[PDB]
């Protein structure tokens, strides 16, 4: 994704639930999913990436402790180009 370029809506949708990516969590494999999905599908379930099966339990501990699970740079980009979609999910 080029700089200041407009991302497709599709590139901004969580691949698990199809909703807009709210507070996206990018795993060390570089697959991304929304925090809600992360919290249900990974943090309290598999500790796998749901796309590729990468073990992620130690990764989770590390960033949990440091409040750095969220990919702040991608979150910023999603809020900028799809603000309305983000507020609708918050609601
Ligand atoms: Zn999701
Ligand atoms: Zn993965």
UniProtKB/Swiss-Prot annotation:
It is found in: Nucleus. The modification Phosphoserine is found at residue 68. Transmembrane segments: none annotated. Sumoylated with SUMO1 by PIAS4 in response to double-strand breaks (DSBs). It comes from the Eukaryota. Changing residue 55 to D: Does not affect the monomeric structure but abolishes ability to monoubiquitinate H2A in nucleosomes. A zinc finger (RING-type) spans 14-53. Belongs to the RNF168 family. E3 ubiquitin-protein ligase required for accumulation of repair proteins to sites of DNA damage. Acts with UBE2N/UBC13 to amplify the RNF8-dependent histone ubiquitination. Recruited to sites of DNA damage at double-strand breaks (DSBs) by binding to ubiquitinated histone H2A and H2AX and amplifies the RNF8-dependent H2A ubiquitination, promoting the formation of 'Lys-63'-linked ubiquitin conjugates. This leads to concentrate ubiquitinated histones H2A and H2AX at DNA lesions to the threshold required for recruitment of TP53BP1 and BRCA1. It is linked to Riddle syndrome: An autosomal recessive disorder characterized by increased radiosensitivity, immunodeficiency, mild motor control and learning difficulties, facial dysmorphism, and short stature. The MIU motif (motif interacting with ubiquitin) mediates the interaction with both 'Lys-48'- and 'Lys-63'-linked ubiquitin chains. The UMI motif mediates interaction with ubiquitin with a preference for 'Lys-63'-linked ubiquitin. The specificity for different types of ubiquitin is mediated by juxtaposition of ubiquitin-binding motifs (MIU and UMI motifs) with LR motifs (LRMs). Monomer. Interacts with UBE2N/UBC13. This is E3 ubiquitin-protein ligase RNF168. It comes from Homo sapiens. The gene is RNF168. The chain holds residues 3 to 93 of 571 of the full protein.
């Amino acid at each position: 994704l080029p700089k200041d370029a407009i991302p497709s809506l599709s590139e901004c949708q969580c691949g698990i639930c199809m909703e807009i990516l709210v507070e996206p969590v990018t795993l060390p494999c570089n697959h991304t999913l929304c925090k809600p999905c992360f919290q249900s599908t990974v943090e309290k379930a598999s500790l796998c990436c749901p796309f590729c099966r990468r073990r992620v339990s130690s990764w989770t501990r590390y960033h949990t402790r440091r409040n750095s699970l969220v990919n702040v740079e991608l979150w910023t980009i999603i809020q900028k180009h799809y603000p309305r979609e983000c507020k609708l999910r918050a609601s």
